[PDB]
Amino acid sequence: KPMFCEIIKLANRKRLIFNTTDERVYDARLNYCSTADSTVQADCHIYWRLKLRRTDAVFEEYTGQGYSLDTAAYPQQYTDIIRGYYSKHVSSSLAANTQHFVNVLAMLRHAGACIAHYCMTGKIDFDILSKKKHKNKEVVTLSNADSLSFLPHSALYLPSPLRASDPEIFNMLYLLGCACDASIAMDNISNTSGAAKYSMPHYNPLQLSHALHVTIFYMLSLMDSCGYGDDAVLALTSGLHSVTTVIAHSDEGGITRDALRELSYTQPYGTMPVPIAGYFQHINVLFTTQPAWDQFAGIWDYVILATAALVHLSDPGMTVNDVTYPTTLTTKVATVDGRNSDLAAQMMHSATRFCDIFVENLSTFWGVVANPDGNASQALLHAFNIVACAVEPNRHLEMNVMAPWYWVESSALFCDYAPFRSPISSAGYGPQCVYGARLVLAATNSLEFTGEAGDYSAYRFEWTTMRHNPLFNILNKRVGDGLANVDFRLRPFNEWLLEGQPSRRDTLDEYIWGSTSCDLFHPAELTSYTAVCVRFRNYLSGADGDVRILNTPTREVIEGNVVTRCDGIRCLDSNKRIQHVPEVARRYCMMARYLAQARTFGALTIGDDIIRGF
Amino acid sequence: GRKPMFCEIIKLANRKRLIFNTTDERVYDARLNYCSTADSTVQADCHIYWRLKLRRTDAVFEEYTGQGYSLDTAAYPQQYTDIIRGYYSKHVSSSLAANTQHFVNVLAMLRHAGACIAHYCMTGKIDFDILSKKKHKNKEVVTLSNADSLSFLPHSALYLPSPLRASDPEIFNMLYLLGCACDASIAMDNISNTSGAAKYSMPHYNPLQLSHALHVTIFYMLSLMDSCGYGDDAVLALTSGLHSVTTVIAHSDEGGITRDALRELSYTQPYGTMPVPIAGYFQHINVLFTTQPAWDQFAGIWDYVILATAALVHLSDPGMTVNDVTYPTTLTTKVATVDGRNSDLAAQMMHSATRFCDIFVENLSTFWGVVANPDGNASQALLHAFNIVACAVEPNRHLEMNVMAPWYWVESSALFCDYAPFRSPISSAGYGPQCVYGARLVLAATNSLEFTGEAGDYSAYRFEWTTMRHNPLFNILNKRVGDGLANVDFRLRPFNEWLLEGQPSRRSDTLDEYIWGSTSCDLFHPAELTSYTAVCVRFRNYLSGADGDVRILNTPTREVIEGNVVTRCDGIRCLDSNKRIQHVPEVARRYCMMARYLAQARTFG
Question: Who's near B294: CB < 8 A, 6+ residues apart?
Answer without folding.
Answer: A138, A196, B208
